[PDB]
Design an enzyme around this catalytic site. Structure first.
Site, PDB file in Angstrom:
ATOM      1  N   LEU A  22       9.355  -6.672  -3.353  1.00  0.00           N
ATOM      2  CA  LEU A  22       9.260  -6.639  -1.877  1.00  0.00           C
ATOM      3  C   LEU A  22       7.813  -6.864  -1.372  1.00  0.00           C
ATOM      4  O   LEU A  22       7.601  -7.480  -0.353  1.00  0.00           O
ATOM      5  CB  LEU A  22       9.794  -5.312  -1.337  1.00  0.00           C
ATOM      6  N   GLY A  23       6.829  -6.389  -2.117  1.00  0.00           N
ATOM      7  CA  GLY A  23       5.447  -6.706  -1.831  1.00  0.00           C
ATOM      8  C   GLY A  23       4.487  -6.068  -2.797  1.00  0.00           C
ATOM      9  O   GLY A  23       4.852  -5.186  -3.559  1.00  0.00           O
ATOM     10  N   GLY A  25       0.164  -4.770  -3.498  1.00  0.00           N
ATOM     11  CA  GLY A  25      -1.031  -4.218  -2.894  1.00  0.00           C
ATOM     12  C   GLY A  25      -2.057  -3.847  -3.949  1.00  0.00           C
ATOM     13  O   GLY A  25      -1.877  -4.129  -5.134  1.00  0.00           O
ATOM     14  N   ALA A  26      -3.148  -3.234  -3.509  1.00  0.00           N
ATOM     15  CA  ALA A  26      -4.197  -2.767  -4.425  1.00  0.00           C
ATOM     16  C   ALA A  26      -3.669  -1.677  -5.388  1.00  0.00           C
ATOM     17  O   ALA A  26      -4.132  -1.564  -6.532  1.00  0.00           O
ATOM     18  CB  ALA A  26      -5.383  -2.235  -3.615  1.00  0.00           C
ATOM     19  N   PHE A  27      -2.739  -0.874  -4.869  1.00  0.00           N
ATOM     20  CA  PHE A  27      -2.084   0.205  -5.611  1.00  0.00           C
ATOM     21  C   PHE A  27      -1.098  -0.252  -6.704  1.00  0.00           C
ATOM     22  O   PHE A  27      -0.764   0.533  -7.579  1.00  0.00           O
ATOM     23  CB  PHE A  27      -1.322   1.115  -4.616  1.00  0.00           C
ATOM     24  N   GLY A  28      -0.562  -1.464  -6.600  1.00  0.00           N
ATOM     25  CA  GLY A  28       0.587  -1.858  -7.409  1.00  0.00           C
ATOM     26  C   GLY A  28       1.607  -2.719  -6.671  1.00  0.00           C
ATOM     27  O   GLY A  28       1.248  -3.659  -5.967  1.00  0.00           O
ATOM     28  N   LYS A  29       2.872  -2.336  -6.765  1.00  0.00           N
ATOM     29  CA  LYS A  29       3.990  -3.203  -6.435  1.00  0.00           C
ATOM     30  C   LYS A  29       5.064  -2.299  -5.806  1.00  0.00           C
ATOM     31  O   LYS A  29       5.135  -1.122  -6.154  1.00  0.00           O
ATOM     32  CB  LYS A  29       4.505  -3.768  -7.779  1.00  0.00           C
ATOM     33  N   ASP A 143      -5.263   6.412   6.660  1.00  0.00           N
ATOM     34  CA  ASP A 143      -5.059   5.012   6.228  1.00  0.00           C
ATOM     35  C   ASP A 143      -3.937   4.332   7.028  1.00  0.00           C
ATOM     36  O   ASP A 143      -3.069   3.646   6.466  1.00  0.00           O
ATOM     37  CB  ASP A 143      -4.761   4.945   4.694  1.00  0.00           C
TER      38      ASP A 143
END
Ligand SMILES: Cn1cc(-c2ccc3occ(-c4cccc(C5CCC5)c4)c3n2)cn1
Length: 338
Positions: A22-23, A25-29, A143
């Site tokens: 689905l998307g 980011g810096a954190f993962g998936k 955030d």
């Protein structure tokens, strides 16, 4: 190693079958999965990078959501429902109710067009309500941004719009939820004066003056202009440039904040050390202008939104509007009708 465990068809924890991503980011998936133990129900699974900072942030999020979901079991205040967590080949995974696209992604897929004002009004009301619920339980999110506000359903109708000579998607239902509680901090925890990768970041955070609930209100101000314009008003990754952009849109910073900051590098005497006639300086003059000049109409509903935004973008956190107050603002009168 994540690419080896997040592919279509993989099974996590002997129950969740990955459909698709689905998307990222810096954190993962975040991946959509079929839950084979809850009758085939589709869910969303956040797979977190195996990196110390994100593992610690993920453990924190789990504590926070446990408290928020038991305090508000029906999601009356629109925080995302966490269903469980587990470990998979050294990656923390967290399971959520499946929602629609993020508000950022919707804008992107629609060619960076803004939302229309009646939707902005609902979304703003819901965001203010949800985060004020956080502020009532001695938390700050820290955030807030369009990637972290998600539509419960992102379905749309589509037509040609002759006013701007292009096809245009129109949301059917603008209801939202707030996600990402890995930076969320309690009043009684350590408030780190250091902060990391964000540009919805309040002036008190940039100048390391200490922060609390008001920093969220500033971020929400930034989100609302972005929804109205379809693009960010602070497009920069350099702090000093960010402060220069603020000065052009909102006027000069308060003198007492400049005198208190330990970050002396940004200032000469009590002025921002910014060359207006440099390469970067001319880019600021051309991209940014006073806030009210971004208005696309003089109609009173537009003026009402912009008065709210302006109060949210007050420099001094001690003077900034609270969310309690903002829920009573005239911009929202049109929702309470009878
Ligand atoms: C950081 N975070 C996200 C969730 C989250 C939770 C439930 C979700 O149901 C769908 C998504 C989703 C859909 C499209 C795009 C994205 C984007 C990838 C980051 C946002 C998510 C989603 N995200 C919880 N923390």
């Amino acid at each position: 190693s994540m690419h080896l465990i997040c592919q279509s068809g993989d099974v996590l924890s002997a129950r969740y079958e990955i459909v698709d991503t689905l998307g990222e980011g810096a954190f993962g998936k975040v991946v959509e999965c079929i839950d084979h133990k809850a009758g085939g129900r589709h869910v969303a699974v956040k797979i977190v990078k195996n990196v110390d900072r994100y593992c610690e942030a993920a453990r924190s999020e789990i504590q926070v959501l446990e408290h928020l979901n038991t305090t508000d079991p029906n999601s009356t205040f629109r925080c995302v429902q966490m269903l469980e967590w587990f470990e998979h080949h050294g990656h923390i995974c967290i399971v959520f109710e499946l929602l629609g696209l993020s508000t950022y992604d919707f804008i992107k897929e629609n060619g960076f067009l803004p939302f229309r004002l009646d939707h902005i009004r609902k979304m703003a009301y819901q965001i203010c309500k949800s985060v004020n619920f956080l502020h009532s339980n001695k938390l700050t999110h820290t955030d807030l941004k369009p990637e972290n506000i998600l539509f419960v359903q992102s379905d749309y109708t589509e037509a040609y719009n002759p006013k701007i000579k292009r096809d245009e998607r129109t949301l059917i239902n603008p209801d939202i939820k707030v996600v990402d509680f890995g930076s969320a901090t309690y009043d009684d925890e350590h408030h780190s004066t250091l902060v990391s990768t964000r540009h919805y970041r309040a002036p008190e955070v940039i100048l390391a003056l200490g922060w609390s609930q008001p920093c969220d209100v500033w971020s929400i101000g930034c989100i609302l202009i972005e929804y109205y314009l379809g693009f960010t008003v602070f497009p920069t990754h350099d702090s000093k440039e960010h402060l220069a952009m603020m000065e052009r849109i909102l006027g000069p910073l308060p003198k007492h904040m400049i005198q208190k900051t330990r970050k002396r590098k940004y200032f000469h005497h009590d002025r921002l050390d910014w060359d207006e006639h440099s390469s970067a300086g001319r880019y600021v003059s051309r991209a940014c202008k006073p806030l009210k000049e971004f208005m696309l109409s003089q109609d009173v509903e537009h003026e009402r939104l912009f008065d709210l935004i302006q109060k949210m973008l007050e420099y001094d956190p001690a003077k900034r509007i609270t969310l309690r107050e903002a829920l009573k603002h005239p911009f929202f009168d049109l929702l309470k009708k009878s």
